[PDB]
Amino acid sequence: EGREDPQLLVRVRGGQLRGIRLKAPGGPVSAFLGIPFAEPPVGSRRFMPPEPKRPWSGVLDATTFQNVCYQYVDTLYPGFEGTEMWNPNRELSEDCLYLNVWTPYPRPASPTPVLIWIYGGGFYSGAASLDVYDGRFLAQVEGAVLVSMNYRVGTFGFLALPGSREAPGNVGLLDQRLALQWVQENIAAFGGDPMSVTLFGESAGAASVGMHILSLPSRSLFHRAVLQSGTPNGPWATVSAGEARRRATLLARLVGCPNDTELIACLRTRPAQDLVDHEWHVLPQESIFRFSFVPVVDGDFLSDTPEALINTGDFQDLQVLVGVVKDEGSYFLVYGVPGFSKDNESLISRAQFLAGVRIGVPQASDLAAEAVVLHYTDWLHPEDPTHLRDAMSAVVGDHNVVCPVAQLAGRLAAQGARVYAYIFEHRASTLTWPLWMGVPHGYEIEFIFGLPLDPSLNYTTEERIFAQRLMKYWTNFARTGDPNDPRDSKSPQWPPYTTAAQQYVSLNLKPLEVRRGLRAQTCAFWNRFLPKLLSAT
Amino acid sequence: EDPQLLVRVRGGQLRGIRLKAPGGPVSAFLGIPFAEPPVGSRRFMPPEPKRPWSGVLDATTFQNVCYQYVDTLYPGFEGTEMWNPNRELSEDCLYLNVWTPYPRPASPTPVLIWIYGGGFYSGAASLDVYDGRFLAQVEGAVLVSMNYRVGTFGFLALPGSREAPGNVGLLDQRLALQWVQENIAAFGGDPMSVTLFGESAGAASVGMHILSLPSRSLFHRAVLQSGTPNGPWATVSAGEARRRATLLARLVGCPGNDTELIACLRTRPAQDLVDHEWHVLPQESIFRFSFVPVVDGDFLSDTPEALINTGDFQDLQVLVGVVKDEGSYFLVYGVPGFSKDNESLISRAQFLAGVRIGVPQASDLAAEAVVLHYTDWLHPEDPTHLRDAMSAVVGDHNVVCPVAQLAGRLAAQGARVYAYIFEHRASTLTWPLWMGVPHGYEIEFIFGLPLDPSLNYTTEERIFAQRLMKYWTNFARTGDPNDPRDSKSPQWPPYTTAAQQYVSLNLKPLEVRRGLRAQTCAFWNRFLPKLLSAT
Ligand SMILES: CCNC(=O)c1ccc(C)c([N+](=O)[O-])c1
Ligand SMILES: CCNC(=O)c1ccc(C)c([N+](=O)[O-])c1
Ligand SMILES: *[C@@H]1O[C@H](CO)[C@@H](O)[C@H](O)[C@H]1NC(C)=O
Ligand SMILES: *[C@@H]1O[C@H](CO)[C@@H](O)[C@H](O)[C@H]1NC(C)=O
Ligand SMILES: *[C@@H]1O[C@H](CO)[C@@H](O)[C@H](O)[C@H]1NC(C)=O
């Protein structure tokens, strides 16, 4: 070794690691990037569950982010920062099961609460190595141990022939689990407390957190959970065994493949890009907010549907922070609803609205679609292009995030959980999306990871203090199971969401504001009425 | 004897009576017959013009009330008895009443003609709240109210039969209108300026006079308060009218052959028919009536919905409106949990139970939709919100949303519409606080009753009453509720499909609101139909 920084050499079950000393605005942090936690799921291991990483020789260099799991690359607005920032920033490869660790520098004296991050990207995209998931700010400012993983996505993560040995489904979720076990065994070598692991994720990642809450084997690997704008229940996060089998079979046909063994084997001999190229082609209806290859109800990882499981399971032992952004849906409109674009005000007609509702709610019968339309129409101004545009966004937002989240907060709370809830209402001054999209899906993340503290990012000063507040919320929660600062009860208190009072707080530049009822009336429509209506057509 | 009280009409001579209003005398002519008594073999038949008479006919008292059910829900209680008949009951009831200034009007004066409510099963023009002396004395108006046959006697129908063809209660009204044309000029009334106005079943009657071509030459303007011809209660198909008449006949112990069926029904004391009146409804209901106008293809060429959807109303002027709490009055007449004597706090169970009764015709799924829409999900079980939501369901379903639909279709197809909501609860009111401003309690004020000192109304209620009296009569003179002399805004603007503007009648100055329960009425008018039509 000799001449290395001796605070960056660490040993884990797989061997020795050299990390890197990174600059954060307030001082240095330790980073161990590209730690392999599974055997590269390639060749005959494609579609298969992850195997633990076989131990290596020598010091593994862990100073750079590793490959991004093979995935679709968004080309809606090429070069535009707003979409490009989600796009993969390392090489695409099937060899991609690696995780990252940030810690204080030097590494902490006594055992430190751990935060594990699970990225979203609709189960078809995403990586732990994007700028918005930079653990350096949490680690430096809050002294946290931050961990984030890659997990397989798209076909490679979630293609399934349910019941088969060679493609049992959900292997991307099993990737996430393996990382959680890895954390248990190795995080104490970094000064992390493996008896205080808080998961947190966004969209698809929030959904993943949810499925770990609902899968028995995972529940012993963490103690608290944060779900940001995403749920295991709801219309997009899961599929039946039946529907997964249909999509898997169609994709096989689409790329050349005619018994499940035979079929899987031929899929294994296809180049990854040939699978990615045809991935969007197996959806049942012209839709938005629907993703082809997602977690499946197999009766194993998920013993029943998430709706069933939250309707029944016990949750006294659980502490959970959940919330949403103001304008969840607007982001998704430009990927399919005719009339929407980042480049104009997206003022649509009533006829574009009706057509939009059929796309936003692809599984709705004619009657149900009319019900949605009748509910979201403003009958004072039923043709006002502004009111229609905003209503369309609200339809997609409410159906896919806000009412699943409200139903989740509702069910958990009643069943013993300590639930804390927020709506995130601040539009980043640095936002590149148009004003009409409001506070769009995914743009709370930048503040929780604390990017505004990077002087060079041109955020405002009040935005700096704001990000500081959230980091305190998330970490206080992670430390205690409670967002509120213990010593600081002069500032307004964040109360738990109860079924009786349905309280939640506003997250904005102003101090905490307690609100009652989480879009209560409109979610009665989506959660109580609509399923009865589809179940009578 | 007094020459002002001496009027000659086509049929002969009348003696009226001089009455004291608080500010001066009025001339009243009460008990004027406009039709041959529909008794005996002429029961169920259309009315016929009154034969001429000798001598001077005494018209100084109210005549008999059309034979009808008498309410017994709260015996002795003013709140229900004030609707009960205040003269003897008879089938011999086709008589009308006329109030004019004293002395008689020098110039042809605009005429207001009033058509009572009572669900087409009750009512009389002699009720104290329909007293036309105040409008006559104060606004110098000529005011005319009629009786018309109600219940079985006015609306029992064996459609397509000679003997019980339906709608004769409406035809009674129409003959009274033909009478006003022919005779009102002798009282100083202007037959070229006749305004109809009525409440609930009366408002619906008015509605049906608008939608029936023969009536359209008998009036020029219309006021519909708290009722509409469209909606779930004011009409029945020919199929269902035939059903109820057949059934009532078997209950009364009759029988095929329409003729043989209506013949035996004619040989029955009136009470034997009224006794079984409520027993022919198809489901357990509230705000549903056994014998009402029928879509017979004659008086009503097609259904009221269909007719308002296609008619041309280009030179029509209409004043429509509701009270704040339409449904509350009706809850105590059959929804478990509700009462004049409690504060009617109800459980969620009782609320789901009441919706099946509020909306008797609804499928399982449709009632599920009602409950889910009216529940307050911040407070899903709070007995007060549930009670207030029950009242709102009945109100909205039966009055407010029919009104919004009519107001919309009329304005859209040429008509000039003025819309209101009445939000003042009478200080003299005998019903409990929880019912708020119940169905029926604007009439006291439109007719000017607060101007009588002995009624013990408050000073401001006297002042409010005068305002309403002036809206209504101004409307009668011009087709426009607004004073042409006061120069102070706000003004009462026309209801339009675009702006959906209406106003609030209460003690405070006029206030213009937009959207008459727009979101909720979309549910009832647009969605709910598509839903029953898929179960
Ligand atoms: C040209 C092909 N691309 C898509 O279909 C696509 C990409 C991204 C997203 C989020 C969605 N979506 O919301 O359904 C669709
Ligand atoms: C005991 C018999 N009485 C009735 O059925 C009745 C009387 C009045 C009213 C308004 C109603 N209603 O609401 O249908 C019913
Ligand atoms: C916005 O742009 C898209 C595509 O460029 C177009 O289809 C849509 O009609 C436009 N809308 C407006 C209001 O200009
Ligand atoms: C921040 O502002 C400076 C101008 O002072 C500019 O050169 C730089 O590119 C900006 N950076 C970002 C990320 O906006
Ligand atoms: C209201 O009072 C009546 C009078 O007997 C009673 O039957 C009814 O049960 C009462 N309802 C409630 C909710 O107290």
CSV table of C-alpha atoms in Angstrom, one decimal, chain A residues 367-368 370-371 374-382 499-502 516-518 520-521 524-525 528-530 532-533 536, chain B residues 348 365 368-369 372-380 497-500 514-516 518-519 522-523 526-528 530-531 534:
chain,number,residue,atom,x,y,z
A,367,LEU,CA,-68.3,4.5,-19.0
A,368,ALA,CA,-65.4,4.9,-16.5
A,370,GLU,CA,-66.7,9.4,-19.0
A,371,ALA,CA,-66.8,9.4,-15.2
A,374,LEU,CA,-67.2,14.4,-15.8
A,375,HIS,CA,-65.4,14.7,-12.5
A,376,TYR,CA,-62.3,16.7,-13.7
A,377,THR,CA,-64.3,19.0,-16.0
A,378,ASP,CA,-64.9,22.4,-14.6
A,379,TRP,CA,-68.6,23.0,-15.5
A,380,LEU,CA,-68.2,26.8,-15.1
A,381,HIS,CA,-65.6,26.9,-17.8
A,382,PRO,CA,-65.8,23.4,-19.5
A,499,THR,CA,-57.1,8.2,9.6
A,500,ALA,CA,-59.1,10.3,12.0
A,501,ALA,CA,-57.5,13.7,11.2
A,502,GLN,CA,-55.6,13.0,7.9
A,516,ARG,CA,-56.0,18.2,6.7
A,517,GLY,CA,-57.2,15.7,4.0
A,518,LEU,CA,-55.0,14.5,1.2
A,520,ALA,CA,-59.7,13.6,0.1
A,521,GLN,CA,-62.8,13.9,-2.2
A,524,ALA,CA,-62.7,8.7,-2.9
A,525,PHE,CA,-63.4,8.6,-6.6
A,528,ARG,CA,-63.6,3.6,-3.8
A,529,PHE,CA,-65.9,4.3,-6.7
A,530,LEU,CA,-63.8,3.6,-9.8
A,532,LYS,CA,-66.5,-0.8,-8.5
A,533,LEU,CA,-67.3,0.9,-11.8
A,536,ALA,CA,-69.4,-3.6,-13.5
B,348,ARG,CA,-73.7,6.4,8.2
B,365,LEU,CA,-74.1,0.9,-8.1
B,368,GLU,CA,-73.1,3.8,-4.3
B,369,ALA,CA,-72.2,6.7,-6.5
B,372,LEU,CA,-69.6,8.4,-2.4
B,373,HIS,CA,-70.3,11.9,-3.9
B,374,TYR,CA,-72.1,13.4,-0.9
B,375,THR,CA,-69.9,11.9,1.9
B,376,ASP,CA,-67.4,14.4,3.4
B,377,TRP,CA,-64.3,12.3,3.4
B,378,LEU,CA,-62.6,14.6,5.9
B,379,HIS,CA,-65.5,13.9,8.2
B,380,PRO,CA,-67.1,10.7,6.8
B,497,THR,CA,-75.2,28.9,-20.4
B,498,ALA,CA,-71.8,30.6,-20.7
B,499,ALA,CA,-71.8,32.6,-17.5
B,500,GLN,CA,-74.5,30.7,-15.5
B,514,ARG,CA,-71.8,31.9,-10.9
B,515,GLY,CA,-72.7,28.3,-11.5
B,516,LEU,CA,-75.9,26.9,-10.0
B,518,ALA,CA,-72.5,23.2,-11.4
B,519,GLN,CA,-70.2,20.3,-10.4
B,522,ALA,CA,-73.2,17.6,-13.8
B,523,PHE,CA,-73.2,14.4,-11.8
B,526,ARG,CA,-74.8,14.1,-17.2
B,527,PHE,CA,-73.4,11.1,-15.4
B,528,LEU,CA,-76.1,9.4,-13.4
B,530,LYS,CA,-75.4,7.1,-18.4
B,531,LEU,CA,-75.0,4.9,-15.3
B,534,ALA,CA,-75.9,0.6,-18.0
